[PDB]
Amino acid sequence: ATQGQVITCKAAVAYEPNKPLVIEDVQVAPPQAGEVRIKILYTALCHTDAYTWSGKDPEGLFPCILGHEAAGIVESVGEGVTEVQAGDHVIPCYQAECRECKFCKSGKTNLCGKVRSATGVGIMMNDRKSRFSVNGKPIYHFMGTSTFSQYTVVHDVSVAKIDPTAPLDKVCLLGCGVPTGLGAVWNTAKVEPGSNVAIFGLGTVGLAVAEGAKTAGASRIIGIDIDSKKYETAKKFGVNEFVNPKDHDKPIQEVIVDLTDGGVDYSFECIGNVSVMRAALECCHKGWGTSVIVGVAASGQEISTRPFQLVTGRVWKGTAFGGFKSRTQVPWLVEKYMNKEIKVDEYITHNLTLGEINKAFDLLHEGTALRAVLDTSK
Amino acid sequence: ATQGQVITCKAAVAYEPNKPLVIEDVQVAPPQAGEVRIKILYTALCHTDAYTWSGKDPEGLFPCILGHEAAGIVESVGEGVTEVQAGDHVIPCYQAECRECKFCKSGKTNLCGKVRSATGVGIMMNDRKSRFSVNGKPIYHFMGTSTFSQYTVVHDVSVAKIDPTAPLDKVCLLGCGVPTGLGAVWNTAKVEPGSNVAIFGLGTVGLAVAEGAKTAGASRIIGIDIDSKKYETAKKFGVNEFVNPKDHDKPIQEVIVDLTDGGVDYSFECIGNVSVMRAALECCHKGWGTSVIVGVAASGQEISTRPFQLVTGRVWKGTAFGGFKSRTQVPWLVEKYMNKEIKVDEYITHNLTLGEINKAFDLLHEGTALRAVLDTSK
Ligand SMILES: NC(=O)c1ccc[n+]([C@@H]2O[C@H](COP(=O)([O-])OP(=O)(O)OC[C@H]3O[C@@H](n4cnc5c(N)ncnc54)[C@H](O)[C@@H]3O)[C@@H](O)[C@H]2O)c1
Ligand SMILES: NC(=O)c1ccc[n+]([C@@H]2O[C@H](COP(=O)([O-])OP(=O)(O)OC[C@H]3O[C@@H](n4cnc5c(N)ncnc54)[C@H](O)[C@@H]3O)[C@@H](O)[C@H]2O)c1
Ligand SMILES: [Zn+2]
Ligand SMILES: [Zn+2]
Ligand SMILES: [Zn+2]
Ligand SMILES: [Zn+2]
């Protein structure tokens, strides 16, 4: 019985940028005050993990245990902790919800700044140290989650308690991309029935935007991708027209405006490319169009447009985790999935194990691939 | 009895860019269908007139009669014209409100397509000719208004009918600057009581934004200007803290964030400088801050920022004419003025004559100067 004991389990450790992860045995310390030790059963991976693994993230610290999309079962809790207990089923969230800071109390945002000083630098608040080590040397946390491990320790403010019957190998996606996309539509844009939408980038996130728009009652849901094969998959998620920029000499924004007789009501950029972010704004209708940036740009990249774009009534916005409050609304999204009102399973194209995590990274560049879910027991 | 006749009157004609305007006798033809001939009693001027006068519009048409801020008395109307008639007091508006086009009928904007194809090239829709000439040579209209004249002829969808007791030498402001600033607050931003606002540029528009904000209930109303003398006047309009960027080594956005422990709830750019437009966005509070580009604005120049600013909850917007519908709401603004609910008189620092228009141009650059109002009878 592990309560209060150091635990030795496997984890995928990243020692150097752009090099294979190696699966080590590691020591997972027990939870201190406010902390929650989780048996992670299933973890997914996405672009966000690779951005840091590739060495391109100037916040990156090595060595570290990456991973932020997971679902598991609480092993133990540190003192103070009351919203979860041993044996609860949980999804660790990269976005806290402390319910006590300026941000949480504001009623005007899902951002919460409670633990970010510590999680941004790969440690815990309580002692500003890591809970992970190999052979007496610390390994840094990542995103407050570190889910490429059979056990992790997270802050209690980042733990969403979910329906204990929910399949852990599916609801792991509800910690990142799917709520981002759904919520970009439902919370950030607030897309009304009959709206026309354009969606730039038809990966997991974009496809979730499309499901969101479809569920909210959108009419034209126009997808844009540099890989035309992406469209056939995308039709199931609700994309009903499609444009590859490469098939046109004109800037993609002008194509979209032409196609819609003025622009779309809402656009969403789900890639991370600043040029395309500009295009997604400039394809919105004069008077009232709104563009939402979902994509995360590289360090130092800038968006631009001409101020008349905004003066003539377009609005430029962006979204962080779909504007969802993690601890409060991730359980709600689990309920909706249990009730067959949102999709999750359809975003999973590979099921592998943690042993094969390097494969899973390569699959990040297969055009046909979406999420890979990893079973941490092997 | 001047109905039906060409009128000969004084007007200030711009023959080519940058040269002093010439006060000539010109001929003003009678109104044709859908048109209204107005006896302009008072006209002001702003940057928008100077923009074309100085040649800063590579497309500007010469010779022309400029002016777009004015008030007067209808002398006659053409066929089919019902909403005004001779003797009505009116404000000609550069923003049309036809009530019948795609944009007017959307409810989601104030910007009307209707008559732009003629006004945009200095002519009237009915016969695609100008109603002005000198010795038989055509003189182009400007912005559909051409108010630098004792008489002008405009389209009926550009004419607001107002309280006949309102002083014409005051309400001539309510067709441009003052509504743009007030509406920026009340319509575009929808500022709530208790909000903290930053206002960049304390000329007429910025001062109008300040009154807007005071009237709406804002708490901190922070004015930013490069000329520290402007604060004294701004206090009466509601500005209650002041920063001059020249007094600080750090960029102004960082000064304002420090000053407000995270940023303002709303900022307004009232200058036309894309670099300050960026600063206004970047001094908004994480999570919910909104920045309004107040004013057209501007030319060629791009605005930029890092998309993280929007991902983390800031919103970028802009406004033309403060979101007001010209024909319906300029008479409402005149009502508020007559009931002492908005200021107008305080924006006027000079009363000159049409004879002295070139002096009024020079005053556009005088620091202690706000609006100049020109009496057209001299
Ligand atoms: N804001 C948030 O909170 C949040 C949360 C999760 C992920 N994200 C971001 O969303 C983005 C998408 O992640 P994903 O997992 O769907 O990625 P993905 O790699 O599965 O999909 C990206 C898609 O964009 C397409 N694409 C690439 N360049 C393009 C272009 N120039 N024009 C059109 N399409 C183009 C690719 O063909 C691919 O279909 C990433 O930036 C990620 O960082 C944001
Ligand atoms: N529909 C519309 O959006 C609309 C209507 C009317 C006017 N406008 C625009 O709004 C603007 C204002 O006209 P105005 O009549 O108030 O002009 P104004 O010249 O009276 O005022 C501009 C002010 O900005 C200040 N300023 C200049 N550079 C600055 C900087 N770098 N930092 C801080 N302050 C600075 C100047 O000192 C001055 O007080 C103009 O751009 C005009 O083009 C737009
Ligand atoms: Zn992710
Ligand atoms: Zn919080
Ligand atoms: Zn003006
Ligand atoms: Zn119209």
PDB file of N, CA and C in Angstrom, chain B residues 37-73:
ATOM      1  N   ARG B  37     -30.962  70.265 -51.047  1.00  0.00           N
ATOM      2  CA  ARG B  37     -30.060  71.355 -51.085  1.00  0.00           C
ATOM      3  C   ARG B  37     -30.193  72.072 -49.761  1.00  0.00           C
ATOM      4  N   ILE B  38     -29.062  72.303 -49.150  1.00  0.00           N
ATOM      5  CA  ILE B  38     -28.941  72.813 -47.803  1.00  0.00           C
ATOM      6  C   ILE B  38     -28.165  74.053 -47.766  1.00  0.00           C
ATOM      7  N   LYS B  39     -28.676  74.995 -46.974  1.00  0.00           N
ATOM      8  CA  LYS B  39     -28.029  76.224 -46.645  1.00  0.00           C
ATOM      9  C   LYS B  39     -27.204  75.939 -45.418  1.00  0.00           C
ATOM     10  N   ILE B  40     -25.872  75.834 -45.604  1.00  0.00           N
ATOM     11  CA  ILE B  40     -25.009  75.469 -44.499  1.00  0.00           C
ATOM     12  C   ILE B  40     -24.693  76.764 -43.744  1.00  0.00           C
ATOM     13  N   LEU B  41     -24.981  76.816 -42.464  1.00  0.00           N
ATOM     14  CA  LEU B  41     -24.691  78.012 -41.697  1.00  0.00           C
ATOM     15  C   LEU B  41     -23.385  77.940 -40.977  1.00  0.00           C
ATOM     16  N   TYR B  42     -22.969  76.730 -40.522  1.00  0.00           N
ATOM     17  CA  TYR B  42     -21.775  76.522 -39.763  1.00  0.00           C
ATOM     18  C   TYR B  42     -21.190  75.139 -40.182  1.00  0.00           C
ATOM     19  N   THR B  43     -19.862  75.127 -40.360  1.00  0.00           N
ATOM     20  CA  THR B  43     -19.114  73.928 -40.731  1.00  0.00           C
ATOM     21  C   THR B  43     -17.855  73.930 -39.881  1.00  0.00           C
ATOM     22  N   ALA B  44     -17.499  72.740 -39.372  1.00  0.00           N
ATOM     23  CA  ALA B  44     -16.225  72.604 -38.692  1.00  0.00           C
ATOM     24  C   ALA B  44     -15.347  71.793 -39.645  1.00  0.00           C
ATOM     25  N   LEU B  45     -14.184  71.468 -39.143  1.00  0.00           N
ATOM     26  CA  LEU B  45     -13.233  70.715 -39.940  1.00  0.00           C
ATOM     27  C   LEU B  45     -12.417  69.827 -39.016  1.00  0.00           C
ATOM     28  N   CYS B  46     -11.911  68.709 -39.543  1.00  0.00           N
ATOM     29  CA  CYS B  46     -11.031  67.818 -38.750  1.00  0.00           C
ATOM     30  C   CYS B  46      -9.996  67.179 -39.657  1.00  0.00           C
ATOM     31  N   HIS B  47      -9.277  66.207 -39.105  1.00  0.00           N
ATOM     32  CA  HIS B  47      -8.205  65.497 -39.843  1.00  0.00           C
ATOM     33  C   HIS B  47      -8.688  64.862 -41.095  1.00  0.00           C
ATOM     34  N   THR B  48      -9.949  64.467 -41.121  1.00  0.00           N
ATOM     35  CA  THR B  48     -10.416  63.801 -42.321  1.00  0.00           C
ATOM     36  C   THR B  48     -10.388  64.727 -43.544  1.00  0.00           C
ATOM     37  N   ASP B  49     -10.734  65.997 -43.339  1.00  0.00           N
ATOM     38  CA  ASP B  49     -10.657  66.939 -44.457  1.00  0.00           C
ATOM     39  C   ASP B  49      -9.183  67.148 -44.875  1.00  0.00           C
ATOM     40  N   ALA B  50      -8.320  67.301 -43.879  1.00  0.00           N
ATOM     41  CA  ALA B  50      -6.885  67.603 -44.108  1.00  0.00           C
ATOM     42  C   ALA B  50      -6.171  66.431 -44.792  1.00  0.00           C
ATOM     43  N   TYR B  51      -6.525  65.227 -44.381  1.00  0.00           N
ATOM     44  CA  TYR B  51      -6.062  64.043 -45.072  1.00  0.00           C
ATOM     45  C   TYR B  51      -6.176  64.161 -46.620  1.00  0.00           C
ATOM     46  N   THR B  52      -7.331  64.536 -47.148  1.00  0.00           N
ATOM     47  CA  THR B  52      -7.461  64.671 -48.576  1.00  0.00           C
ATOM     48  C   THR B  52      -6.820  65.969 -49.067  1.00  0.00           C
ATOM     49  N   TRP B  53      -6.925  67.037 -48.291  1.00  0.00           N
ATOM     50  CA  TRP B  53      -6.406  68.320 -48.757  1.00  0.00           C
ATOM     51  C   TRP B  53      -4.886  68.180 -49.001  1.00  0.00           C
ATOM     52  N   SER B  54      -4.196  67.492 -48.084  1.00  0.00           N
ATOM     53  CA  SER B  54      -2.707  67.405 -48.088  1.00  0.00           C
ATOM     54  C   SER B  54      -2.181  66.430 -49.154  1.00  0.00           C
ATOM     55  N   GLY B  55      -3.071  65.726 -49.812  1.00  0.00           N
ATOM     56  CA  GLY B  55      -2.719  64.815 -50.842  1.00  0.00           C
ATOM     57  C   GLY B  55      -2.456  63.427 -50.297  1.00  0.00           C
ATOM     58  N   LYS B  56      -2.569  63.234 -48.954  1.00  0.00           N
ATOM     59  CA  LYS B  56      -2.240  61.934 -48.299  1.00  0.00           C
ATOM     60  C   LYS B  56      -3.133  60.830 -48.811  1.00  0.00           C
ATOM     61  N   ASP B  57      -4.120  61.156 -49.626  1.00  0.00           N
ATOM     62  CA  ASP B  57      -4.899  60.157 -50.307  1.00  0.00           C
ATOM     63  C   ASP B  57      -4.469  60.164 -51.763  1.00  0.00           C
ATOM     64  N   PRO B  58      -3.641  59.177 -52.163  1.00  0.00           N
ATOM     65  CA  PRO B  58      -3.190  59.211 -53.555  1.00  0.00           C
ATOM     66  C   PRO B  58      -4.332  59.210 -54.586  1.00  0.00           C
ATOM     67  N   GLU B  59      -5.541  58.794 -54.178  1.00  0.00           N
ATOM     68  CA  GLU B  59      -6.759  58.822 -55.044  1.00  0.00           C
ATOM     69  C   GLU B  59      -7.632  60.133 -55.025  1.00  0.00           C
ATOM     70  N   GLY B  60      -7.443  61.020 -54.045  1.00  0.00           N
ATOM     71  CA  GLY B  60      -8.226  62.269 -53.930  1.00  0.00           C
ATOM     72  C   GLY B  60      -8.521  63.008 -55.222  1.00  0.00           C
ATOM     73  N   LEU B  61      -9.747  63.518 -55.364  1.00  0.00           N
ATOM     74  CA  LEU B  61     -10.183  64.131 -56.587  1.00  0.00           C
ATOM     75  C   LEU B  61     -10.230  65.671 -56.499  1.00  0.00           C
ATOM     76  N   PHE B  62      -9.626  66.347 -57.471  1.00  0.00           N
ATOM     77  CA  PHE B  62      -9.550  67.802 -57.511  1.00  0.00           C
ATOM     78  C   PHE B  62     -10.048  68.273 -58.867  1.00  0.00           C
ATOM     79  N   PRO B  63     -10.580  69.478 -58.931  1.00  0.00           N
ATOM     80  CA  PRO B  63     -10.886  70.385 -57.815  1.00  0.00           C
ATOM     81  C   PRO B  63     -12.097  69.875 -56.993  1.00  0.00           C
ATOM     82  N   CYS B  64     -12.145  70.187 -55.689  1.00  0.00           N
ATOM     83  CA  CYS B  64     -13.298  69.766 -54.851  1.00  0.00           C
ATOM     84  C   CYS B  64     -13.621  70.701 -53.734  1.00  0.00           C
ATOM     85  N   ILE B  65     -14.858  70.578 -53.244  1.00  0.00           N
ATOM     86  CA  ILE B  65     -15.243  71.275 -52.015  1.00  0.00           C
ATOM     87  C   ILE B  65     -15.255  70.241 -50.878  1.00  0.00           C
ATOM     88  N   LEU B  66     -14.376  70.440 -49.916  1.00  0.00           N
ATOM     89  CA  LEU B  66     -14.300  69.586 -48.780  1.00  0.00           C
ATOM     90  C   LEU B  66     -15.330  70.002 -47.714  1.00  0.00           C
ATOM     91  N   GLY B  67     -15.205  69.363 -46.567  1.00  0.00           N
ATOM     92  CA  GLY B  67     -16.076  69.589 -45.406  1.00  0.00           C
ATOM     93  C   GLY B  67     -17.113  68.529 -45.260  1.00  0.00           C
ATOM     94  N   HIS B  68     -17.221  68.040 -44.045  1.00  0.00           N
ATOM     95  CA  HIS B  68     -18.201  67.012 -43.764  1.00  0.00           C
ATOM     96  C   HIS B  68     -18.903  67.220 -42.400  1.00  0.00           C
ATOM     97  N   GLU B  69     -18.509  68.197 -41.571  1.00  0.00           N
ATOM     98  CA  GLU B  69     -19.107  68.452 -40.263  1.00  0.00           C
ATOM     99  C   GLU B  69     -19.845  69.807 -40.357  1.00  0.00           C
ATOM    100  N   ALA B  70     -21.178  69.781 -40.257  1.00  0.00           N
ATOM    101  CA  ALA B  70     -21.926  70.977 -40.533  1.00  0.00           C
ATOM    102  C   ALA B  70     -23.370  70.866 -40.150  1.00  0.00           C
ATOM    103  N   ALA B  71     -24.015  72.027 -40.115  1.00  0.00           N
ATOM    104  CA  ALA B  71     -25.432  72.085 -39.836  1.00  0.00           C
ATOM    105  C   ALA B  71     -26.026  73.262 -40.531  1.00  0.00           C
ATOM    106  N   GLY B  72     -27.282  73.119 -40.898  1.00  0.00           N
ATOM    107  CA  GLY B  72     -27.894  74.154 -41.704  1.00  0.00           C
ATOM    108  C   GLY B  72     -29.385  73.931 -41.842  1.00  0.00           C
ATOM    109  N   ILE B  73     -29.948  74.564 -42.856  1.00  0.00           N
ATOM    110  CA  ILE B  73     -31.413  74.664 -43.023  1.00  0.00           C
ATOM    111  C   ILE B  73     -31.701  74.308 -44.470  1.00  0.00           C
TER     112      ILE B  73
END
